[PDB]
Amino acid sequence: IVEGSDAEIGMSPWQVMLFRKSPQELLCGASLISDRWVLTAAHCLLYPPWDKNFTENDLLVRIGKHSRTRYERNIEKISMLEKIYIHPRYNWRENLDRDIALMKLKKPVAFSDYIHPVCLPDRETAASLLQAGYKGRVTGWGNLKETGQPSVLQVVNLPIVERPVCKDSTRIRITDNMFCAGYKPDEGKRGDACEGDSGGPFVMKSPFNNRWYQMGIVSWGEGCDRDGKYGFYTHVFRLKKWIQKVIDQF
Amino acid sequence: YEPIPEEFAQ
Amino acid sequence: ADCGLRPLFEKKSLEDKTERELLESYID
Ligand SMILES: Cn1cc(CNC(=O)c2cccn2C(=O)[C@@H](CC2CCCCC2)NCC(=O)O)cc1C(=N)N
Structure with a gap:
C-alpha cells in the first residue's frame, strides 16, 4: 500500500x-x-x-x-x-x-x-455501492514505494473510477470482470496498492445495514501510485x- | 520474518 | 451469519479513524 x-x-x-x-x-x-x-x-x-x-x-x-x-x-x-x-x-x-x-x-x-x-455482495448491494466516486478501502502488507516494506498492516481509502477513464489509462484490454480505483491527477489525494498486496480485499461499508462487503480483489496495476494510472480489481459480484x-x- | 512454530509445517 | 460486523467496532458501536470518509462519499 x-x-x-x-x-x-x-x-x-x-x-x-x-x-x-x-x-x-x-x-x-x-x-x-x-x-x-x-x-x-x-x-x-x-x-x-x-x-x-x-x-x-x-x-x-x-x-x-x-x-x-x-x-x-x-x-x-x-x-x-x-x-x-x-x-x-x-x-x-x-x-x-x-x-x-x-x-x-x-x-x-x-x-x-x-x-x-467479511460479507459477499448480493445484486442489490453491488448495484447501490459500485459507483464511480464512491470510496472503498484496501489493506495489505505490500510495498510502500514503487520498486521499503511496512512494519504493520496498511490501509488506504480510494474512490471507484468511471469505466471509460479506466479503459483510457492503459493498453491492456479491460473486461467486465474488473474495475479500477484511485484518485485522478487533479484530485490532490493519492494512494494505491502495490506488489505484495495482491489478493487483498477491496471493501466497502453499506450505509443500509452497516456491514462490510468485499467488492474487489487486488488484481493488477502498472507501477504504484503513478499519476494517470489506476489500480484494477477483480469484480467479485x-x-x-x-x-x-x-x-x-x- | 519471524520463524513460526514447527508443528504448523508438518 | 453476522459477517461484516467487526468485534472491536460495529459490535461495540465504535468507529474507526477513517470510515466516515467512506460513508460521506456515498451520495444519495
Ligand atoms: C503495480 N501493481 C501490482 C499489483 C499486484 N498484481 C500484479 O503484480 C500482477 C501479477 C502479475 C503481473 N501483475 C501486474 O500488475 C503487472 C501488469 C499485468 C497486467 C495484466 C497482464 C499481465 C501484466 N504490473 C506490471 C507493472 O507494474 O509494470 C497491484 C498493483 C497496483 N494496483 N499498483
Missing part, C-alpha cells in the same frame, strides 16, 4: 496473509469469507510467466494478524489448505481476466476480536455465481 497508514487493531478482522512454507515469506493477501473459506487472487497461486504454480502443501494461511513479520502468539491463527480452486476461465495469458481463487481450510477457524469474516458453485459442491 502506497500513501496509506497503519491500520488500527481489529480494523480488518478478515485480512489474511498467504505464507510460503519454504522459504518462509509473505506471498499474498487474501480474505476470510467464512470459517472454512478464503478468497484471494488467482495470480497468487498460478502465473506461468513467472513460473509461479503453488499447490496446497506449499502454503499456509495466517489469520488475525497486524504485524507483518512477527509471530503474533495468542493472536494470529495459522491454518493449512485442504484444496485450492482457480477459476476455470482465469486468463493469465492476456489480461488476468477472472483473477480469482477459493481456498478450503483443513480445519475451521474460530472467530475472535481479531478474526471475523460478477464471479459470485462461480463462488457459490464451488462452495455448495465442496
Whole structure:
C-alpha cells in the first residue's frame, strides 16, 4: 500500500496473509469469507510467466494478524489448505481476466476480536455501492514505494473510477470482470496498492445495514501510485455465481 | 520474518 | 451469519479513524 497508514487493531478482522512454507515469506493477501473459506487472487497461486504454480502443501494461511513479520502468539491463527480452486476461465495469458481463487481450510477457524469474516455482495448491494466516486478501502502488507516494506498492516481509502477513464489509462484490454480505483491527477489525494498486496480485499461499508462487503480483489496495476494510472480489481459480484458453485459442491 | 512454530509445517 | 460486523467496532458501536470518509462519499 502506497500513501496509506497503519491500520488500527481489529480494523480488518478478515485480512489474511498467504505464507510460503519454504522459504518462509509473505506471498499474498487474501480474505476470510467464512470459517472454512478464503478468497484471494488467482495470480497468487498460478502465473506461468513467472513460473509461479503453488499447490496446497506449499502454503499456509495466517489469520488475525497486524504485524507483518512477527509471530503474533495468542493472536494470529495459522491454518493449512485442504484444496485450492482457480477459476476455470482465469486468463493469465492476456489480461488476468477472472483473477480469482477459493481456498478450503483443513480445519475451521474460530472467530475472535481479531478474526471475523467479511460479507459477499448480493445484486442489490453491488448495484447501490459500485459507483464511480464512491470510496472503498484496501489493506495489505505490500510495498510502500514503487520498486521499503511496512512494519504493520496498511490501509488506504480510494474512490471507484468511471469505466471509460479506466479503459483510457492503459493498453491492456479491460473486461467486465474488473474495475479500477484511485484518485485522478487533479484530485490532490493519492494512494494505491502495490506488489505484495495482491489478493487483498477491496471493501466497502453499506450505509443500509452497516456491514462490510468485499467488492474487489487486488488484481493488477502498472507501477504504484503513478499519476494517470489506476489500480484494477477483480469484480467479485460478477464471479459470485462461480463462488457459490464451488462452495455448495465442496 | 519471524520463524513460526514447527508443528504448523508438518 | 453476522459477517461484516467487526468485534472491536460495529459490535461495540465504535468507529474507526477513517470510515466516515467512506460513508460521506456515498451520495444519495
Ligand atoms: C503495480 N501493481 C501490482 C499489483 C499486484 N498484481 C500484479 O503484480 C500482477 C501479477 C502479475 C503481473 N501483475 C501486474 O500488475 C503487472 C501488469 C499485468 C497486467 C495484466 C497482464 C499481465 C501484466 N504490473 C506490471 C507493472 O507494474 O509494470 C497491484 C498493483 C497496483 N494496483 N499498483
